[PDB]
Design a protein around this ligand. Structure first.
Ligand SMILES: C=C1/C(=C\C=C2/CCC[C@]3(C)[C@@H]([C@@H](C)[C@H](CCO)CCCC)CC[C@@H]23)C[C@@H](O)C[C@@H]1O
Length: 240
């Protein structure tokens, strides 16, 4: 029941993802080094990770069918509000339930609860984030479903400041109808049972995680000593 327009969308989002997410993590060496000892010892490294990942999210987003047809202003608001969410989503790819960590190929670039808690953010964020990663992993999404969810999350009609919501909604619905049809045609049961409803629920989980991150960013940002450890892009995207 997948239309050729729908199959074209899947094709585009898979390539867009493949072009902006390097599964070998080679670029992690360009980051300020990780420090495992020290309350902000991991901040430099993870700030660089986040900042790098913001760029990659933008690159993926520009390739979303219809995104280009949005105003510059609407592209800005959507990316500013979705960045940390898509970072959490795309991170599920390296997250492993084996030891509850983000395993990016090597021990230097393998981040657990202890590491992630040495960057100025509290368990109020980290605990439900890890829970989120586990709950997302268990959905065992097809990569097709994975890239559709990231794109749907980015093109959300209800983000603060969106001007032409209806168009944003038109774009998202096409992605949504692609996701729902894909699940019907390509995802065998029981893995498919209620899967769309479950993925859309992860988008609600992400709002909650976004809100809490926003709170904790404001806190830490209020100490220039901490803001100094970030990057210009991170400062511009999460608030300046
Ligand atoms: C960022 C990514 C990766 C992992 C994600 C992680 C582990 C470290 C902490 C991250 C960045 C979380 C953020 C919110 C951090 C929470 C406290 O350390 C904040 C970092 C401070 C700049 C979200 C996803 C988490 C690795 C790979 O999957 C690529 C992906 O883009």
């Amino acid at each position: 029941k997948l239309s050729e327009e729908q199959q074209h969308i899947i094709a585009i989002l898979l390539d867009a993802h493949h072009k902006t997410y390097d599964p070998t993590y080679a670029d992690f060496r360009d980051f300020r080094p990780p420090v495992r000892m020290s309350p902000l010892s991991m901040l430099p490294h993870l700030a660089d990770l986040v900042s790098y990942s913001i760029q990659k999210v933008i690159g993926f987003a520009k390739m979303i069918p219809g995104f280009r047809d949005l105003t510059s202003d609407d592209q800005i608001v959507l990316l500013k509000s979705s960045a940390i969410e898509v970072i959490m989503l795309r991170s599920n790819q390296s997250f492993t339930m084996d030891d509850m960590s983000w395993d990016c190929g090597s021990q230097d670039y393998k981040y657990d609860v202890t590491d992630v808690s040495k960057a100025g953010h509290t368990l109020e964020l980290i605990e439900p984030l890890i829970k989120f990663q586990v709950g997302l992993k268990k959905l065992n999404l097809h990569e097709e479903e994975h890239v559709l969810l990231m794109a749907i999350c980015i093109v959300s009609p209800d983000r603060p400041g969106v001007q032409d919501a209806k168009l944003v909604e038109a774009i998202q619905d096409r992605l949504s109808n692609t996701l729902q049809t894909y699940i019907r045609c390509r995802h065998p049961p029981p893995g498919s049972h209620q899967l769309y409803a479950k993925m859309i629920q992860k988008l609600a989980d992400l709002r909650s995680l976004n809100e809490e991150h926003s709170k904790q960013y404001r806190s830490l940002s209020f100490q220039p000593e901490n803001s100094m450890k970030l990057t210009p892009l991170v400062l511009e995207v999460f608030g300046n």
